[PDB]
């Protein structure tokens, strides 16, 4: 898993995040549709972007942003002991959306992609070393659920 050392820089890093969470959701969410166009076609609420400025202008995209990082930082913040809030997510994502898990990859470094844009020389190399493992550990966790629902 993660050290204490490694949990305490993952939830140092989030406090960046919880200050501005709509506008980190927005761009996290902004990055996976014009990096990876498939991933639009999931939500049959947002296929009508599109462009990147309907996204940016979409106040349900800064909504469904907020959803999504206020979900995945009630998880960092169990350290690893995240069973129950896991694994409906997984259960949801894999049978309802139909997500793939390279899909949970990109979101991933979507969210690394994003930190380092909003905080340029602020979000060291321990730093991302750290919410990179811990990441990892959240989509690891979504994975062996989605082995058990045979889902793919
Ligand atoms: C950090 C990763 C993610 C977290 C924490 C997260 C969290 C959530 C939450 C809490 C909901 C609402 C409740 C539910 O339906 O389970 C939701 C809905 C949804 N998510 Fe995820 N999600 C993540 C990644 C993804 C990815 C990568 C995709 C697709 C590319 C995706 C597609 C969807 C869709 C289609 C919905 C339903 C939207 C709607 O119709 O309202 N999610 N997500």
């Not at 206020?70 to 809030?85: F, N, Q, R, V, Y």
Request: hydrophobic share 40%.
């Amino acid at each position: 898993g993660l050290s204490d050392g490694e949990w305490q820089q993952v939830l140092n890093v989030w406090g960046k995040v919880e200050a501005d969470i709509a506008g980190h959701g927005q761009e996290v969410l902004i990055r996976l549709f014009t990096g990876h166009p498939e991933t639009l076609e999931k939500f049959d609420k947002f296929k009508h972007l599109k462009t990147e400025a309907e996204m940016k202008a979409s106040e349900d995209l800064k909504k469904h942003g907020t959803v999504v990082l206020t979900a995945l930082g009630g998880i960092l913040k169990k350290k690893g002991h995240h069973e129950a809030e896991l694994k409906p997510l997984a259960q949801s994502h894999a049978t309802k959306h139909k997500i793939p898990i390279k899909y949970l990859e990109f979101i991933s470094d979507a969210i690394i992609h994003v930190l380092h844009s909003k905080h340029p020389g602020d979000f060291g190399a321990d730093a991302q070393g750290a919410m990179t493992k811990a990441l990892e550990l959240f989509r690891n966790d979504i994975a062996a659920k989605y082995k058990e629902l045979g889902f793919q």
